[PDB]
Amino acid sequence: VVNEEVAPWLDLVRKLGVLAGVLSDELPVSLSVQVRGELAAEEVEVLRLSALRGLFSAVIEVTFVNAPALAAERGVTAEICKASESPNHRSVVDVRAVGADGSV
Amino acid sequence: SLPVVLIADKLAPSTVAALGDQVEVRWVDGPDRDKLLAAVPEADALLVRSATTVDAEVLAAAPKLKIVARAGVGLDNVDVDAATARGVLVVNAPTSNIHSAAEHALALLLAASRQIPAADASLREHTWKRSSFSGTEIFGKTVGVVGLGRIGQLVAQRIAAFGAYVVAYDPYVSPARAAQLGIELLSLDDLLARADFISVHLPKTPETAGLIDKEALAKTKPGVIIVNAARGGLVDEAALADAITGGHVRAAGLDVFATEPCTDSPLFELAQVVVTPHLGASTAEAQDRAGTDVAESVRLALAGEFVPDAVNVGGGVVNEEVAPWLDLVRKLGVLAGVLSDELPVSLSVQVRGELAAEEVEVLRLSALRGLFSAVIEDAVTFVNAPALAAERGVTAEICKASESPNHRSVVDVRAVGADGSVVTVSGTLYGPQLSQKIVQINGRHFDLRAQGINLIIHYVDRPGALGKIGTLLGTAGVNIQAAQLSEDAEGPGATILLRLDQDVPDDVRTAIAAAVDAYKLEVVDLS
Amino acid sequence: SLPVVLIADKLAPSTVAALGDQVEVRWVDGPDRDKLLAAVPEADALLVRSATTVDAEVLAAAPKLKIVARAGVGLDNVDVDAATARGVLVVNAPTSNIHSAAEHALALLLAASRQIPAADASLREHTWKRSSFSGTEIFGKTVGVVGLGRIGQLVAQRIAAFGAYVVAYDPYVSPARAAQLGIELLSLDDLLARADFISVHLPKTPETAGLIDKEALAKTKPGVIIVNAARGGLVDEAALADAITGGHVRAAGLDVFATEPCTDSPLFELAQVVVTPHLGASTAEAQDRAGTDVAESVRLALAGEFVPDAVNVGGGVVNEEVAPWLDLVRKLGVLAGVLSDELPVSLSVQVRGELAAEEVEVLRLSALRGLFSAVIEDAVTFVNAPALAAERGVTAEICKASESPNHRSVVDVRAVGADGSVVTVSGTLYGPQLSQKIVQINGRHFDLRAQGINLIIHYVDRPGALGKIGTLLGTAGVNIQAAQLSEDAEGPGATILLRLDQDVPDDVRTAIAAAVDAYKLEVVDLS
């Protein structure tokens, strides 16, 4: 069960992955999803899947158990972090894409 | 161990008797630097007039100083920033000169209408030139009061008993307050057109400086008598001389000069202009009151009580959590006032989220300080809310809510109009540096630095408007640092706010207004 | 010799501990007449709840009585006229039930939306009829508050946290006050059209009685739930039943009845109508507060201090010179309110001539009492000005002047609008009988009894207007006792005021308005 607090973020975090991908010059070698604030008390694994899926749609002609194997075979490692501490927003999700050349 | 109150200028023990028997009062020759610096280390309070300068050197040398009290209205001789910087409460006596100044304005108006000095001079030269003089009668005439603060109000009251009709210009008094005074509020242009006498009662702010220039003088009624016992320069000195010489304004009275000491004004060569060396408060009664006022402020302050006449913030007065919010909230007040069509009758300050757990009454005062900046002089930070409410007709309240919708803390300033309309502006602070951010205006959200010159436009012609505006601005050489724009949720309108690196010349503002068919165009400096 | 405080109803010593140790507190069985009458001769103060009747007999029997205090809101059991007649201060606890009443309105709204009683009954009959019920959700809905006094304000605050949008109807709250509350002020018609829920919070005055009749019920939204925990009859009981039965209003909640005790209402035969036997204040907390409130009022009163919660005037409270002016000035407030386009933001009371030498602050309260009569219940004479200002947004001031232009004394009431417009009405007293006279309205002078039914018309079509009006009135059978009329000094308008022997039917008012092309037509009873 995706928690009621988490469900509404799925689509947002997908769009963040879309954005991070299109805004990346090269295909990223890594994707990092950082959950901060109140949301960080929830189960948010599924937000990593959403990001990745946003990342890859913005690049490839993509489902939820599809994307981790697609990511692997495109050499994109993912990562998810959770921290209660958010400096401004009550809850915020950051999607970070790093390219082969070290660009962010 | 009795607290030490050091008096560094000429204030009599009797003048300062409001201090209890619970203090040790000492005197020093303040103007003598060596004496002062030797006496101040032991001082818990320092009272001063105008002759002693309370700079950083003095403050650094006074390790237990809790209050600097200036027995007067001006704060030129006190570095209020340094005092705040070291947690020292600064106080003045803000209403101590009001009757003496009002009376002096009237003195100058009568002295000019009836040529008292010249006449006195003729008799002083042992001749009788009665046939030469011709005065002007006040009864039945219209008197324009430019600025309706406390003093302008007293002048209107006194002049009204002469049978004069009183009109006033002051965008910073509510219409209901003016109506309670029985005074008709007018545009400046209309006051100029109507007034047989003009008395100026503005503070000096760049909003105010040289307000009555040649353009203005030319709109007045032929035969006007004009008095300025307010601030040097409110009436352009050279333009006055021109208008006096040309005959259009019959007479004037001045107590204050663009720069003083003033000994070389051309106005001094004109008989029809009565002049006095800044005497408006030169009265035993006003100097005594300045002292007894400030003696009471110092008592309250030493009694850990609340100090209405405070000018700044110093001491426990404010938490570390709250302190950084003061300046942001001041800027929200400025903004809510600029975005308003007319003076709101009140400000509602809503404090939401984490900040709501704090003691935040001072934030209500910040908002008001911001709203009224155009009639407040820079040094002052705090203003007396009850006095503001009674004098100008505007109030403020604070409301707290546990929840802030988005940011962990937000402050919303609601400026409410007499007709029940509302203008809302919000800010937060966040980050290691606690940068001040404007985050909402009237239901539109964004994130813009609360700083610099900001241009705000409400307008109706939408397509290509961004291009038109940015192109006009950039042709004028104006850099656009940041921007926020959105089409109204309901209606034909749209709005945009831009941070610029400089002000916008009037012609270009006119061009922009024309280009996008603006109904509101404002430029506000949030620094 | 310690002052005697007699408690004649069930108030605990602890409830009344706010009385000092400087009084002797005794108890009596108030409802027992013999006991009461035997105990009261020694009483300096008398506290009572609802069970003891404080009539003239009681008062005549209590020669040193200074205060009658009612621990509650109603004054039905006290003859306030007789008490005033004998110089006895009467006090109540005017805000003691506000939270319990607000909570009960909410209780009734929820109980009706979710059919709590019926549902509880089904389970009480040992059956499970879950499928039968269908409730109504408050979130996102519009809630109409009819009357925005203190309690209506609390209800709006509580209901707003349910995510409901709040609108209100109250001609007696300023637009700026409503905007500070974040509430949209509406015409009654517009509230009716928009509201999914209606909560009534009016006082009972003939301005108010049966406000929501069949005509009104028919304007509401299909599916409305309507609550009245205010006053019996505000919503027409039979019209409600009709609308409930017909289905148009889904549910209702009532705590009060056109007449109570009520045991036979048809509404009691309707499941979709939740009913409670006037329980709004039936709370230990509200009864305790009523007591501690009134215990403090009695302390202040015995301390020769000022009694905010006073309901009338008694004792030194007012000079013999001033006393007769109270009722005149109340009538000036009524008049200034009627002649105003909307609620003034303030009243300026000017006292001029001989009366100016008197202590006349109470006159400021009279004016306000008059202005607000439509939302004040008859027994009350004094109202709490600070509370009125905070609750409804209207203030009053007094100004004195030595000179009255014509009469030896005159009082002018200036009603000032938020836009700075002003309505002025003046009266005097003179003569062996001190007859009350209205002597000015808006710069027009005359001499008319301040009494009876007065019709006031501002109108634009002038020639033969006197004939048209007097002919319509006299065809309706209406006698015209006195009259004052004049053509405006500037403009096409004219005005007339007439004292009539009866009210004017609506159709004839419509006819008169039509006949002279009126822009304002009002009928006010000044008795």
UniProtKB/Swiss-Prot annotation, chain A:
Full protein: residues contained: 318 to 423 of 528
Function of the molecule: Catalyzes the reversible oxidation of 3-phospho-D-glycerate to 3-phosphonooxypyruvate, the first step of the phosphorylated L-serine biosynthesis pathway. Also catalyzes the reversible oxidation of 2-hydroxyglutarate to 2-oxoglutarate.
Family designation: Belongs to the D-isomer specific 2-hydroxyacid dehydrogenase family.
Name of the protein in question: D-3-phosphoglycerate dehydrogenase
UniProtKB/Swiss-Prot annotation, chains B, C:
Matches recorded under InterPro entries: ACT-like_dom_sf, ACT_dom, ASB_dom_sf, D-2-hydroxyacid_DH, D-isomer_2_OHA_DH_cat_dom, D-isomer_DH_CS, D-isomer_DH_CS1, D-isomer_DH_NAD-bd
Matches recorded under Pfam families: 2-Hacid_dh, 2-Hacid_dh_C, ACT, PGDH_inter
Pathway this chain belongs to: Amino-acid biosynthesis; L-serine biosynthesis; L-serine from 3-phospho-D-glycerate: step 1/3
Biological process (GO), any one: L-serine biosynthetic process
Catalytic residue positions: 231, 260, 278 (proton donor)
Domain ACT: 454-526
Coiled coil location: none
Keyword Cell division: no
Family label: Belongs to the D-isomer specific 2-hydroxyacid dehydrogenase family.
NCBIfam families to which the protein is assigned, alphabetical: PGDH
This protein's name: D-3-phosphoglycerate dehydrogenase
